[PDB]
Design a protein around this motif. Sequence first.
Motif, PDB file in Angstrom:
ATOM      1  N   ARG A 247      48.593 107.580  31.218  1.00 29.58           N
ATOM      2  CA  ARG A 247      48.798 108.718  30.300  1.00 29.58           C
ATOM      3  C   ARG A 247      48.595 108.328  28.820  1.00 29.58           C
ATOM      4  O   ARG A 247      47.861 108.981  28.084  1.00 29.58           O
ATOM      5  CB  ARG A 247      50.209 109.300  30.517  1.00 29.58           C
ATOM      6  CG  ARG A 247      50.717 110.218  29.400  1.00 29.58           C
ATOM      7  CD  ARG A 247      52.043 110.851  29.758  1.00 29.58           C
ATOM      8  NE  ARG A 247      51.875 111.954  30.703  1.00 29.58           N
ATOM      9  CZ  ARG A 247      52.853 112.756  31.118  1.00 29.58           C
ATOM     10  NH1 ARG A 247      54.101 112.602  30.683  1.00 29.58           N
ATOM     11  NH2 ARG A 247      52.577 113.717  31.978  1.00 29.58           N
ATOM     12  N   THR A 248      49.236 107.242  28.409  1.00 33.36           N
ATOM     13  CA  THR A 248      49.186 106.747  27.036  1.00 33.36           C
ATOM     14  C   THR A 248      47.804 106.242  26.619  1.00 33.36           C
ATOM     15  O   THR A 248      47.392 106.424  25.471  1.00 33.36           O
ATOM     16  CB  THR A 248      50.252 105.630  26.861  1.00 33.36           C
ATOM     17  OG1 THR A 248      51.537 106.173  27.195  1.00 33.36           O
ATOM     18  CG2 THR A 248      50.285 105.080  25.428  1.00 33.36           C
ATOM     19  N   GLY A 250      44.933 107.336  28.034  1.00 32.83           N
ATOM     20  CA  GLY A 250      44.217 108.597  27.962  1.00 32.83           C
ATOM     21  C   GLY A 250      42.821 108.480  28.535  1.00 32.83           C
ATOM     22  O   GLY A 250      42.610 107.766  29.506  1.00 32.83           O
ATOM     23  N   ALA A 254      43.430 108.643  32.366  1.00 34.42           N
ATOM     24  CA  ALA A 254      44.429 109.704  32.538  1.00 34.42           C
ATOM     25  C   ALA A 254      44.047 110.712  33.625  1.00 34.42           C
ATOM     26  O   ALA A 254      44.916 111.221  34.338  1.00 34.42           O
ATOM     27  CB  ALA A 254      44.650 110.432  31.218  1.00 34.42           C
ATOM     28  N   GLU A 330      48.872 114.644  26.076  1.00 35.01           N
ATOM     29  CA  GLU A 330      47.407 114.714  26.201  1.00 35.01           C
ATOM     30  C   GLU A 330      46.609 114.415  24.934  1.00 35.01           C
ATOM     31  O   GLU A 330      45.513 113.878  25.019  1.00 35.01           O
ATOM     32  CB  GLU A 330      46.977 116.081  26.748  1.00 35.01           C
ATOM     33  CG  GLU A 330      47.405 116.338  28.177  1.00 35.01           C
ATOM     34  CD  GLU A 330      46.854 117.655  28.721  1.00 35.01           C
ATOM     35  OE1 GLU A 330      45.617 117.830  28.749  1.00 35.01           O
ATOM     36  OE2 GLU A 330      47.661 118.519  29.112  1.00 35.01           O
ATOM     37  N   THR A 333      46.849 109.927  22.397  1.00 34.37           N
ATOM     38  CA  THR A 333      46.464 108.881  23.338  1.00 34.37           C
ATOM     39  C   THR A 333      45.700 107.779  22.605  1.00 34.37           C
ATOM     40  O   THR A 333      45.093 108.009  21.559  1.00 34.37           O
ATOM     41  CB  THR A 333      45.577 109.423  24.489  1.00 34.37           C
ATOM     42  OG1 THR A 333      44.312 109.851  23.969  1.00 34.37           O
ATOM     43  CG2 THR A 333      46.259 110.579  25.225  1.00 34.37           C
ATOM     44  N   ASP A 335      42.900 106.492  23.578  1.00 33.00           N
ATOM     45  CA  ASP A 335      41.473 106.854  23.585  1.00 33.00           C
ATOM     46  C   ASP A 335      41.119 107.738  22.385  1.00 33.00           C
ATOM     47  O   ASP A 335      40.055 107.575  21.780  1.00 33.00           O
ATOM     48  CB  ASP A 335      41.092 107.566  24.884  1.00 33.00           C
ATOM     49  CG  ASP A 335      39.615 107.958  24.927  1.00 33.00           C
ATOM     50  OD1 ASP A 335      38.764 107.051  24.854  1.00 33.00           O
ATOM     51  OD2 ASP A 335      39.315 109.170  25.018  1.00 33.00           O
ATOM     52  N   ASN A 336      42.022 108.659  22.039  1.00 38.85           N
ATOM     53  CA  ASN A 336      41.792 109.574  20.926  1.00 38.85           C
ATOM     54  C   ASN A 336      41.875 108.864  19.571  1.00 38.85           C
ATOM     55  O   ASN A 336      41.094 109.168  18.669  1.00 38.85           O
ATOM     56  CB  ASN A 336      42.730 110.794  21.003  1.00 38.85           C
ATOM     57  CG  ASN A 336      42.248 111.859  22.002  1.00 38.85           C
ATOM     58  OD1 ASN A 336      41.066 111.911  22.351  1.00 38.85           O
ATOM     59  ND2 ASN A 336      43.160 112.726  22.438  1.00 38.85           N
TER      60      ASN A 336
END
Length: 401
Positions: A247-248, A250, A254, A330, A333, A335-336
């Motif tokens: 989740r973290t 992403g 995820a 969401e 993250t 990835d973001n």
Amino acid sequence: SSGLVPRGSHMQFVNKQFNYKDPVNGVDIAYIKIPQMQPVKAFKIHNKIWVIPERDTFTNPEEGDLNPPPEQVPVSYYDSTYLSTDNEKDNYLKGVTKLFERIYSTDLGRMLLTSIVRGIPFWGGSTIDTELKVIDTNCINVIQPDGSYRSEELNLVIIGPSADIIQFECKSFGHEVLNLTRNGYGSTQYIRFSPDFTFGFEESLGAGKFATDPAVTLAHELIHAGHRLYGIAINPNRVEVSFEELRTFGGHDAKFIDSLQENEFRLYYYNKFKDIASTLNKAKSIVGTTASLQYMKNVFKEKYLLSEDTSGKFSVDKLKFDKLYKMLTEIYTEDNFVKFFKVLNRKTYLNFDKAVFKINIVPKVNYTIYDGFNLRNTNLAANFNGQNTEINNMNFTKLKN
Ligand SMILES: [Zn+2]
């Protein structure tokens, strides 16, 4: 020169350009105690956020020493001497400061840090169902120059690592019966972290040897902190790689948490927020505290985005809950953050770290708030050359593979 203020007059998130030798004042530089220990010198970088530039021999009673165990898990690193001198503690403080400013320089980091500051741990500490009361372990004891203490509520502590220097994590003090990180309440988060070390990974585009931007690593832990402050962390038995880690991180990682399972988590925490709403509604008194019951009730209306009717009764709005929940799980993250920073990073959480490096991000000739290692208008600008451990060799000293 550290380049802490690349635009404007003053830092936008961190409240003071501290030096470690700045004298105590009982307000934002103070000796403090975690609720035994000798007082430690700590710095209040923002409302609800303190930095303790010390190795963490405090939080865990069985980890009261920096002594390595008998040879030790492969990915680990020890040095009992790191962060023992004042020069080092000064560099740690300025390094952590610089990384908060880098995070806050992106739209996503402003969102995340705002959510963190607003995420005050719930006053669920009363044995009497109709009384609001603080939980003692969501506070620190702040000493004044004259020697008096006062208890101060806080959301986040950044502290130095314990024995294993590269074991970063986000942890917190538990309750007798309540699961504070999984019941909506939240609790004060302690992040073990160092800005003075980072990790290596391999990437083609022969294979290059690169280093993780420590702004990404800190953001990872702050994302955990957000989950845990709103009490919506995934049970760590759900896995080894935990669902909480996937989740973290992403991205495509995820996606592997199946959408029906996700729906089930969301419903669980929706109901937990409803339980908080009724606790607030059934509240008759407050102990603490010279603040009224109505005022404290309102702090938590604000935290959880609760709706209030004309009768002054609170409820959870489905659209506001979905918004908050989605933001925390969401949007925030790793990835973001990689996308916002425009840095090179591992493509999946499952990647194996190759090496550990010593780094120094405090000089602006080494690392900037805007560009990290990949300094614009230089040879480091192109192809993530600033993160390339061979091209930018002067910024990375290999300590171990
Ligand atoms: Zn993690």
